[PDB]
Design a protein around this nucleic acid. Structure first.
Lengths: 103, 51, 48, 51, 82, 48, 50
DNA sequence: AGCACAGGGAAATGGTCTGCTTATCGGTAGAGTG
RNA sequence: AUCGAGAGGU
DNA sequence: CACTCTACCGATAAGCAGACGTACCTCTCGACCCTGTGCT
């Protein structure tokens, strides 16, 4: 509540901390979370779209084949960027306006 | 403003033009195109894409 | 280091109409800062 | 093939500049709650979007 | 700025997609900060889903102050919006 | 030190000429040899 | 002893937790200790009352 | 008496587009003459 | 760290 | 009171200069001088 930031790695007894209403927990992004995904150059609206996360092994961003066209992307070496919304308002906007099916 | 036409530039001791305020504000890398209309952002990942 | 949220990405989020997304990416996630301004002269004040 | 490659490498920059110019000219034009299309100054660009 | 009468309102009676996104985000943010929930919960934990189910029942206590270009505005209840 | 330092500087930085005329000098005349593959080095030795 | 009866204004910020039937009693007490429609501040969730 | 080393040092000459600054030049307008 | 140069990726 | 020689403010263009230039990303490699003057 006071703004102090408890780091759970360097707190000797991180697991034994009761939580109190009003606090925040920076929890790992999990399956089903909403993120913005894009490629450059961003030539039109459809180059930044909302996606639901699926946390999975290996180090590449994996995405459906039919979504390549709006990104003008292919898998010969392209790199793409992912932005994680950090608020309820931003999540609502990505989910309700920007999502891939809505596009 | 160190890009005045018809004047000698205020060089650096390393033989480089000085970074004037106009140069700080000007250009793609200036404040208003490199730091205000665009930024480096937190909470962003990047990597190769596969199918 | 962070990733650049450029001009074209800002344009894409403008055409989407996501005002709060832009506010978050360009203010809350990059260089959020606070100042105190004088209501008389409109210049940043000395704040303790 | 060399001509094709050169054309690609030049056209990319040409169109990038064109698009930046286009967006800067019309970034402020928005549909209002009375149906009209106006810019940031309130000047009416269209009386009905797309007519 | 002058408020327009409820009978004189000329804007659309439907909730715009931008209005829907803003309303859901704002209500979800308020719920996450312990705002009382005006709908029965069946074990939902995501504030956004709680706000969505509040919206489906038109139980979001919010207004939209739509501004006309001249500065006059109309207040629309989230409940009365279609 | 004149000849030694001048040749060393021009070959090291690639900036081709006096240290004091860096802007007017040619640049990129000298490049770090590309030791990624034998063929890449062969190519780099024959580049115009 | 010149006493002046004046109309004054204040901008009260209210937490979402208080957004219930007793909202207006809370504002009046806060005003006394220290009503217009409540403007929900973007990005924060509070409500500004004049 | 020759070099460290901080003080005192800047020099041989080697694309179309707009808005400013100059020359140009009519079309009258004085009348200077008649 | 800063600045400059170069090599590359899509 | 028919004239034709210079004053005008106009417009004309004239040559001038000055001003502009895709996105995002990865990495490597190099970075003053000259001369007074105390020391020994």
């Amino acid at each position: 509540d006071t703004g102090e930031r408890i780091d759970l790695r360097y707190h000797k007894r991180a697991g034994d901390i009761p939580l109190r209403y009003g606090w925040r927990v920076e929890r790992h992004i999990r399956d089903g979370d909403v993120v913005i995904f894009n490629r450059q150059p961003s030539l039109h609206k459809m180059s930044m779209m909302g996606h639901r996360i699926r946390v999975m092994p290996y180090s590449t961003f994996r995405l459906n084949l039919s979504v390549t066209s709006p990104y003008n992307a292919d898998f010969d070496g392209d790199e793409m960027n992912m932005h994680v919304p950090q608020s309820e308002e931003t999540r609502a906007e990505i989910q309700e306006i920007t999502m891939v099916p809505k596009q | 403003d160190n890009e005045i036409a018809g004047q000698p530039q205020a060089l650096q001791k390393s033989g480089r033009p000085l970074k004037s305020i106009r140069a700080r504000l000007k250009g793609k890398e200036g404040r208003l195109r490199g730091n205000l209309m665009g930024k480096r952002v937190d909470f962003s990942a990047r990597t190769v894409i596969t199918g | 280091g962070g990733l650049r949220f450029g001009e074209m990405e800002r344009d894409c989020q403008i055409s989407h109409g996501c005002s709060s997304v832009l506010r978050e990416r360009l203010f809350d996630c990059s260089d959020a800062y606070r100042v105190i301004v004088c209501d008389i002269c409109g210049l940043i004040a000395i704040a303790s | 093939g060399r001509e094709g490659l050169i054309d690609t490498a030049v056209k990319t920059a040409e169109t990038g500049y064109i698009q930046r110019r286009l967006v800067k000219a019309m970034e402020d034009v928005m549909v209002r709650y009375d149906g009209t299309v106006r810019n940031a100054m309130g000047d009416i660009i269209q009386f009905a979007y797309g007519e | 700025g002058k408020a327009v009468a409820k009978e004189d309102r000329t804007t659309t009676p439907y909730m715009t997609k931008y209005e829907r996104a803003r309303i859901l985000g704002t209500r979800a943010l308020q719920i996450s900060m312990n705002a009382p929930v005006l709908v029965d919960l069946e074990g939902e934990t995501d504030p956004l889903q709680i706000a969505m189910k509040e919206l489906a029942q038109k139980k979001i206590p919010l207004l939209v102050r739509r501004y006309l270009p001249d500065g006059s505005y109309e207040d629309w209840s989230v409940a009365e919006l279609i | 030190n004149i000849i030694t330092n001048g040749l060393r500087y021009s070959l090291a930085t690639g900036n081709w000429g006096d240290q004091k005329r860096s802007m007017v000098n040619r640049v990129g005349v000298s490049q770090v040899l590309n030791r990624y593959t034998f063929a890449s080095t062969l190519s780099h030795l024959r580049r115009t | 002893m010149p006493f002046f009866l004046k109309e004054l204004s204040l901008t009260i910020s209210l937490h979402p937790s208080y957004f219930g039937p007793r909202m207006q009693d809370y504002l009046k007490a806060k005003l006394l200790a220290d009503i217009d429609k409540g403007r929900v501040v973007p990005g924060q969730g509070f409500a500004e009352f004049e």
